[PDB]
């Protein structure tokens, strides 16, 4: 007798498992539920081999008459197609219609679990075929995911993609198109000049030069390489053997989503090239893309001097081997990708002093001096590399990279440089400062108290808060190096340059980032929203009289609904959040009871006190909050972030007039393609309705609800449907009409791109990404640059605080 005790162990879906018995399918079965899928919302856009598939998951289920089969208000779960005698619906016990062998229903439950609306009743003993909603989705998922999977290996293994970019290859993964041969079907034509790569997935097919047999090609071979490329006649005539599956790329469509290959792939290899240079490393990606597109390109026989004692400032191989010379003294190989001329790029005046001479057959690119000024659009190429080069260190930071272009080349125009002597103080703690420091040479510590903190050197920077705020400094800089120099901005010059505005958003946002807030600190002023999940207070802290917001969270209701992982993950997203347009938390809470998410106060209302004030947006208008809103949605998505609920209801207005994105409870970091299904329903894009995978392009397809309410006014789907069921089949198959009193052909054509429900027709949702959006014509005389910089006037400035 052992004196320890041991714990014990421990709606809709329960019925159907007493109606189920295994039933091996008849040919005549399998072509009812191919006839009957075709007619379903979401299968239609499906083909043979898929709806195949989802009809071999289909249950066999048996009844006799006067039996229930689902109530009304229910957990909806299961969707079914009628096999044999009929059935009779019921509506608030209200008898209706009346289905034989063909018709379908319970559609909605696919979808989403809604409440019932009917009951179907059994009238004689008839049978029915069945599936549910967890084995439907996971079948479209895993066959979708399973296509794109195997059609990436295909991209993988085709040589003339290896030099894409991930991003690259995944964007053109989704051009691929699957295309069926039967025996005896000719592929390819010798002399028709095809632009279509293929490859065999799955079986056999021969090929004949000239009406000869040449050899046969199995699952793994491929072809069309060079049609992707260049305008050729094809070499052969490919013919299918057995029945054959090949997947395929056309060239229109790669253009379309990516551009040009050839100028793409370039870019990649010159990129790469001119990376390893220290310099070439601190240039823009437009920078260094303009350089690959404009660099000349040279193929050389062995032992040429390629140089000698022209204009010529880099050279990157390509191909080959060149051997570098000071005058008589070798000095190096450059093999494949390395490069040279650092020297000359740093010094345009500087005598070319060296000589290259090719090894052997080479193919080299040549960076000449008008290829760098233009890149740089200045004559003045060493200025221009040092402007460039304290650009590229100040845009890393939050105060400097919203400002506009004009404001930011002012300042760097202003820099002046000091130098130092080791174990200078540079900045003493306790002193006022007023100076913002950036290092050009050596190295310096930091330290507080007597304790050193940390080491800085080249590039780095100190300092930036004495441009906001006089204050006293919190820590010393001591010179760690034999001459330091460093970059300096006086206060006094950042205000001459810096307007009203900006300056109060930078100065409110960096004080209410960095003053540490401890919970029983908090007297709270009021409620200001009650969203069911949680409860949102405006607060005040006792010690600096700022004032937040914050959101209380109960555990009851995190836990109720198995969000345990989740909201650690939005966490994680929400605190990261550093962009003017999007909240910025300051820090989160724990406790017994309730999680709480203390963020800044917005005290200038919500969007839609915005657009009820204003009605139907005139260009200029709509063109603000939606380039607001796209500037908030490209800083999440280059962090891999899909937003997924973007609706007026999530933005709110600071005092100002700018916008706030607000609430990312359905927002994720995206691994590949996601399939939840998860939206406001009125803004959800059809692809993730359809349930075959999306990504972060469908907040693009909310953009163009977004704008169709600003300027049309109701929604583009489903504006007077209540039923969820009847807004995603407006969605899917609706017709997009624009009311006569839209005069603005630009707006319209946006509207369209925007709401096109195809992703690779979409605007925006190409390798370009949002510039297609920006440059669009709609945009015309609109200026990003002091978007961002708050240097336009809004819609809509609110005069007081509105609740
Ligand atoms: C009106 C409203 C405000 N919020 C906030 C919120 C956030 C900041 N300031 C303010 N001030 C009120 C101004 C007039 C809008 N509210 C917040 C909010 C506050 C703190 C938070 F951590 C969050 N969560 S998060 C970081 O995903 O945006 C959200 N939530 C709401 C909800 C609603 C209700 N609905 C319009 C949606
Ligand atoms: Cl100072």
Redesign the pocket.
């Known amino acids: 007798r052992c004196n320890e005790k041991k714990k014990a162990i421990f709606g809709e879906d329960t019925l159907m498992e007493d109606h189920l018995q295994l039933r091996e399918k008849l040919s005549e079965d399998i072509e009812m539920i191919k006839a009957s899928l075709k007619n379903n919302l979401v299968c239609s856009t499906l083909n043979d081999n898929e709806i195949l598939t989802l009809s071999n998951y289909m249950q066999f289920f048996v009844f006799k008459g006067g039996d229930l089969v689902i109530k009304q208000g229910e957990k909806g779960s299961y969707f079914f197609i009628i096999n044999s005698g009929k059935f009779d619906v019921y509506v608030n016990d209200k008898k209706v219609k009346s289905m034989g062998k063909g018709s379908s229903f319970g559609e909605a439950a696919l979808i989403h679990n809604t409440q019932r609306s009917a009951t179907i009743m059994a009238e004689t003993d008839g049978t029915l075929w069945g599936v549910q909603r967890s084995t439907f989705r996971a079948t479209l998922k895993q066959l979708s995911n399973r296509n794109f999977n195997e059609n990436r290996s295909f991209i993988d293994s085709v040589s003339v993609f290896d030099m894409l970019t991930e991003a690259q290859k995944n964007m053109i993964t989704n051009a691929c198109v699957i295309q069926m041969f039967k025996p005896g079907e000719t592929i390819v034509k010798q002399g028709d000049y095809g632009d279509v790569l293929f490859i065999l997935k799955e079986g056999k097919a021969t090929v004949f030069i000239n009406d000869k047999e040449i050899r046969v090609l199995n699952k793994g071979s491929y072809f069309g390489e060079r049609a992707l490329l260049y305008d050729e006649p094809r070499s052969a005539t490919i013919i299918a053997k057995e029945p054959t599956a090949c997947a395929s790329i056309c060239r229109k469509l790669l253009n379309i989503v990516l551009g040009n290959l050839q100028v793409v792939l370039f870019r990649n290899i010159m990129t790469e090239a001119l990376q390893q240079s220290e310099i070439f490393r601190q240039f823009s990606a437009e920078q260094l893309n303009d350089l690959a597109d404009t660099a000349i390109v040279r193929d050389y026989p062995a032992n040429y001097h390629i140089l000698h004692k022209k204009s010529v400032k880099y050279l990157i191989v390509l191909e080959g081997k060149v051997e570098l010379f000071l005058d008589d003294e070798s000095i190096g190989i450059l093999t494949r990708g390395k490069s040279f001329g650092d020297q000359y790029v740093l010094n345009q005046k500087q005598k070319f002093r060296h000589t290259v001479k090719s090894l052997d057959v080479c193919k080299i690119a040549l960076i000449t001096e008008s290829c760098l000024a233009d890149c740089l659009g200045d004559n003045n190429i060493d200025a221009s590399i040092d402007h460039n080069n304290k650009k590229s260190i100040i845009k890393k930071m939050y105060i400097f990279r919203y400002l506009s272009e004009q404001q930011c080349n002012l300042l760097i125009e202003a820099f002046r440089t000091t130098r130092y002597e080791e174990g200078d103080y540079i900045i003493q703690e306790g002193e006022v400062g007023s100076r913002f420091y950036i290092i050009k040479n050596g190295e310096v510590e930091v330290t507080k108290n007597g304790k050193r903190l940390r080491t800085l050197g080249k590039n780095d920077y100190f300092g930036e808060r004495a441009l906001l705020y006089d204050e006293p400094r919190t820590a010393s800089i001591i010179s760690k190096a034999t001459s330091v120099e460093c970059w300096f901005v006086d206060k006094s010059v950042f205000l001459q340059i810096i307007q009203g505005p900006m300056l109060t958003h930078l100065e409110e946002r960096i004080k209410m980032q960095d003053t540490k807030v401890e919970m029983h600190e908090l007297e709270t002023e009021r409620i200001?929203?009650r969203?069911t999940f949680g409860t949102?207070k405006?607060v005040h802290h006792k010690p600096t009289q700022i004032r937040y917001?914050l959101?209380c969270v109960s555990k009851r209701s995190i836990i109720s609904l198995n969000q345990q992982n989740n909201i650690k993950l939005e966490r994680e997203i929400?605190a990261e959040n550093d962009h003017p347009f999007i909240?910025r938390?300051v820090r989160t809470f724990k406790d017994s009871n309730c999680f709480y998410?203390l963020?800044?106060?917005?005290?200038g209302?919500?969007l839609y006190d915005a657009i009820r004030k204003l009605g139907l947006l005139s260009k200029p208008q709509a063109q603000f909050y939606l380039g607001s809103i796209i500037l908030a949605i490209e800083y999440l998505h280059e962090r891999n972030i899909v937003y997924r609920d973007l609706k007026p209801?999530?933005i709110?207005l600071d005092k100002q007039g700018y916008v706030k994105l607000?609430?990312?409870?359905c927002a994720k970091k995206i691994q590949g393609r996601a399939y939840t299904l998860v939206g406001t329903p009125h803004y959800m894009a059809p692809e993730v309705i359809l349930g075959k995978g999306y990504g972060c392009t469908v907040d693009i397809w909310a953009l163009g609800v977004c704008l169709y309410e600003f300027i049309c006014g109701p929604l583009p789907f489903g504006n007077d449907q209540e039923d969820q069921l009847e807004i995603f089949r407006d969605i899917l198959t609706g017709q997009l009409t624009f009311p006569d009193y839209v005069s603005d052909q630009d707006s319209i054509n946006l509207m369209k791109r925007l709401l096109c429900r195809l992703p690779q027709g979409r605007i925006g949702c190409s390798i370009n990404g949002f510039k297609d959006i920006k440059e669009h014509a709609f945009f015309g005389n609109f200026n990003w640059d002091k978007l961002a910089g708050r240097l336009l006037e809004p819609p809509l400035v609110s005069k007081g605080e509105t609740?």
């Open positions: 200001i929203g969203g949102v405006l917001a959101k929400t909240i938390l998410f963020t800044e106060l917005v005290t209302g919500e209801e999530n709110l607000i609430d990312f409870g609740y």
